[PDB]
């Protein structure tokens, strides 16, 4: 007892075991297949016109034969448009990346409780505000192929695999250390590339590795970066001053995003602050508020610019 979804691209289909997995109490499986015949009708026209529009009016999740008639319908239109095809890789838009985000944490996260994450923005949670407030911070950094993007402290890595699908970066690295995390990762890349495929979506390419990003390996990583995103938010004194430590060794115009800031945004040098790292780079807090109704959310553009550093000497030695 199963059911299947071909693909509009002709990649292997997608094969559901009957009954459906759940999700959560108001989430399943039945829900993530009649969605993803609907993206697919969307953005195939020809398909929303062969499909018999009523199948998706009349469907009874709970009942196998109405999901099989449901999935039938759909792979008879995809037959049909292979066919017209016949007779004579884009990025996803923003709608369809994230159901697809959420389609391969459903498919890779399958015990979320293991993750043992109780706090705002964590995986469990990828879709209610940390998609809009990633989607707003790729719109605002505006990163070319010359880039390098890594997200300190990666989780399962849907930061890594949103920045992919959106941007040209050269290339995207996520770094985990905690266990769980770091081994749900790499069913979420082999999930995302899969599904992203099955689509017919591009992605730029990425890495999702474990590791501890204040190791020694990872000092000299950092320094050549040009885009860091951390969620610092909840990180403790030291792994502030050891990020700190790493961000000092970042070429001119690094930019770091967080969710913290790493210096004052009123930051003021003088004799007594050279030590800082206000001393050698910009931040500026940006605010989606500042069409953007969700939570009043905000993040940290912090830029390399040791001229900051350069002026105060010169003004010292020019008075
Ligand atoms: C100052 S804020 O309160 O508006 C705010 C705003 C943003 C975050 N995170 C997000 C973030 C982090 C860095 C850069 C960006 Cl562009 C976005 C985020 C998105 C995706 C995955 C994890 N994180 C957090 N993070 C947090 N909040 C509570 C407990 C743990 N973390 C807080």
């Known amino acids: 007892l199963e059911l299947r979804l071909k693909s509009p691209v002709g990649a292997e289909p997608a094969v559901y075991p009957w009954p459906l997995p759940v999700y959560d109490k ?3 499986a039945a829900h993530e297949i009649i969605e993803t015949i609907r993206w697919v009708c969307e953005e195939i026209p020809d398909l929303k016109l062969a499909m018999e529009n009523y199948v998706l009016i009349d469907y009874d999740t709970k009942s196998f034969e109405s999901m099989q008639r449901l999935c039938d319908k759909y792979n008879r239109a995809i037959d049909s448009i292979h066919q017209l095809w016949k007779g004579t890789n884009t990025r996803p838009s923003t709608g369809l990346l994230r159901h697809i985000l959420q389609q391969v944490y459903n498919h ?3 015990d979320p409780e293991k ?3 109780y ?3 964590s ?5 209610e505000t940390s998609f809009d407030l990633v989607a707003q911070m790729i719109d605002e950094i505006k990163m070319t192929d010359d880039d390098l993007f890594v997200d300190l402290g990666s989780g399962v890595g849907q930061v890594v695999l949103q920045v992919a699908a959106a941007t040209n970066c050269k290339h995207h690295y996520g770094v985990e250390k905690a266990d769980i995390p770091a081994k749900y990762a790499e069913t979420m890349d082999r999930e995302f590339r899969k599904w992203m495929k099955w689509y017919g979506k591009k992605h730029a390419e990425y890495t999702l590795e474990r590791g501890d990003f204040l190791s020694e390996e990872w000092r000299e990583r950092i320094a050549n970066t040009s885009v860091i995103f951390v969620n610092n938010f909840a990180f403790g004194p030291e792994v502030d001053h050891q990020l700190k430590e790493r961000f000092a060794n970042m070429k ?17 040098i003088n004799s007594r602050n050279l030590s800082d790292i206000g001393t050698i780079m910009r931040v500026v807090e940006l605010s989606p508020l500042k069409s953007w109704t969700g939570k009043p959310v905000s993040y940290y553009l912090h830029t390399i610019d040791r001229t900051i550093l350069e002026n105060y000497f010169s003004s010292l030695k020019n008075p």
């Open 119 to 121: 706090e705002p923005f």
């Open 108 to 110: 890779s996260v399958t």
């Open 252 to 268: 001119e115009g690094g930019r770091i995003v967080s969710s913290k800031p790493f210096a004052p945004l009123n930051f003021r």
């Open 123 to 127: 995986p469990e949670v990828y879709g």
């Open 26 to 28: 108001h989430h399943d």
């Open 115 to 117: 993750l043992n994450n």
